[PDB]
Ligand binder design. Structure first.
Ligand code: HEM
Ligand code: 08Y
Length: 456
């Protein structure tokens, strides 16, 4: 859509350039762009990703209408996305009735009931993380978190996806490990994705040549793996649960598409959040101590964490939430406007991408006292009442929110519990303070986080 849409509707925004739109304003990443646009333009603004119009919204009533009230009718889909091949069937990429059907099929799979049955499996790799952690501390030397937390994230991934039990950090040559590893989140400011934003007319050329953004080698490998783990003796993983739910039914290709997208959805995200959490805990030693005291109180002398004990830990839950306030690694939620609507007094035309800038709202002075400050007390039970759930959106909201939210929390918390029970984390002189964010399209630190690990 032409660069004249937002002026035509009287909506403010950075003036776009011919062809590029506003992409040159991303030279400091999505988060800084979004903060700046918010401070200079107000409650609503418009900008262009190449030819594509994007309208940013910040009013919580309007946000609710997009994410919740008009999800099925008008705002069903994420922005159209590069060449995807058979991954068009992955729930996160799927559209309209195909989406509604896969969400309906995959919902039972993410119950709390199922998640409880998955707990022992997840906990088991907590112990593997601890054992590993022990050694790279007993050594001495600063620890790289993305590495220790990367391996942990994959270990839970493999075993919870289909019972491939592997010590990922001490088997960095296992082909299953070295293939899954390649399912990292897309940096949409990298040269390929920039090019595709400015030349989106080239995507169908890429689809016909089978050039896919999920590398062919990796998805080939997994499709082949899943087929063979499927075919027999029968004596609790995502595959099994999907196998069983096979308009309804779940077809074969669709099944593998989900198995891949759970990896990609879960892998770099969990690991990234875990590293942020540790960063904050190390730079706030009092918060770290307080967390360890709550853990020792609930699980006396290092008792194994359980579904129920995890859920009782209030301060743990507060620490996790406040980290996700500061580092909401999705950055933004988006929905395509399927048809002209008028929402809370404002006309949004067909085809616009409506964007909710979580990162900016999470640090908004209007909603948050000293926004740049890590303060878990924000979430204390008698203080969290004034947290608006359309301003704080780390897992998004509505029918299309994170389907893996309770799983991701449970996973992250089971890790933190086992780590904190055994260790304390302290900054090195090599630790970057204060933390600086990457200028690329992912929310992550500029340099990796390294910290000293010490047995308690
Ligand atoms: C680790 C921390 C995680 C965070 C912060 C996170 C955040 C998000 C966000 C912001 C969305 C977009 C929702 C929206 O548009 O409103 C999303 C969607 C999604 N998440 Fe997560 N996520 C995490 C982990 C996971 C995990 C472990 C899984 C494993 C299955 C997962 C599966 C998905 C899927 C499939 C979607 C798309 C759902 C749909 O389109 O219907 N996520 N997540
Ligand atoms: C790409 C899909 C398949 C992954 C899906 C998902 O499964 N997720 C799991 C956890 C996080 C979430 C996801 O990566 O995070 C999501 N974010 C995105 O993928 C957003 C989509 C973008 C995009 C797609 C296509 C062309 C583009 N040009 C430009 Br400029 C951008 C862009 C910005 C980019 N933003 C900032 C992120 C949601 C928070 C909206 C998302 O859609 N994800």
């Amino acid at each position: 859509h032409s660069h004249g849409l937002f002026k035509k509707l009287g909506i403010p925004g950075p003036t776009p350039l011919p062809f590029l739109g506003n992409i040159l304003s991303y030279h400091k990443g999505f988060c800084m762009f979004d903060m700046e646009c918010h401070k200079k333009y107000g409650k609503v603004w418009g900008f262009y990703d190449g030819q594509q119009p994007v309208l940013a919204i910040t009013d919580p009533d309007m946000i609710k209408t997009v994410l919740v009230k008009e999800c099925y009718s008008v705002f069903t889909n994420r922005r159209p996305f590069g060449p995807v091949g058979f991954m068009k069937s992955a729930i996160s990429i799927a559209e309209d009735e195909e989406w509604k059907r896969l969400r309906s099929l995959l919902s039972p799979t993410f119950t709390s009931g199922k998640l409880k049955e998955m707990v022992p499996i997840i906990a088991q790799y907590g112990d593997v993380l601890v054992r590993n952690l022990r050694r790279e501390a007993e050594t001495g030397k600063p620890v790289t978190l993305k590495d220790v937390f990367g391996a942990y994230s994959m270990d839970v991934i493999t075993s919870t996806s289909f019972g491939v039990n592997i010590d990922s950090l001490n088997n960095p040559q296992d082909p299953f490990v070295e293939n899954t590893k390649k399912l990292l989140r897309f940096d949409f400011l990298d040269p390929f994705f920039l090019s595709i934003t400015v030349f989106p007319f080239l995507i169908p050329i890429l689809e016909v040549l089978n050039i896919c953004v999920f590398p062919r080698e990796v998805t080939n490998f997994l499709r082949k793996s899943v087929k063979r783990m499927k075919e027999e003796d029968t004596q609790v993983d995502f595959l099994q649960l999907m196998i069983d739910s096979q308009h309804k039914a779940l077809s074969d290709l669709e099944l593998v598409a989900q198995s891949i997208i759970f990896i990609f959805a879960g892998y770099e995200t969990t690991s990234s959040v875990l590293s942020f959490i540790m960063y904050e805990l190390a730079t706030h030693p009092d918060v770290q101590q307080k967390l360890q005291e709550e853990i020792d109180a609930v699980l006396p002398n290092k008792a194994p964490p359980t579904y129920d004990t995890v859920l009782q830990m209030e301060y743990l839950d507060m620490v996790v939430n406040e980290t996700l306030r500061l580092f909401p690694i999705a950055m933004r939620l988006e929905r395509v406007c399927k048809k002209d609507v008028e929402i809370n007094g404002m006309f949004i035309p067909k085809g616009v991408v409506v964007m909710i800038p979580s990162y900016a709202l999470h640090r908004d002075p209007k909603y948050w006292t000293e926004p740049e400050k890590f303060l878990p007390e924000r979430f204390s039970k008698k203080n969290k009442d004034n947290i608006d759930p359309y301003i704080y959106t780390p897992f998004g909201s509505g029918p299309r929110n994170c389907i893996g939210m309770r799983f991701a929390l449970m996973n992250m918390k089971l890790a933190l519990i086992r780590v904190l029970q055994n260790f304390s984390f302290k900054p090195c002189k090599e630790t970057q303070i204060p933390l600086k964010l990457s200028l690329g399209g992912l929310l992550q630190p500029e340099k990796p986080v390294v910290l000293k690990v010490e047995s308690r």
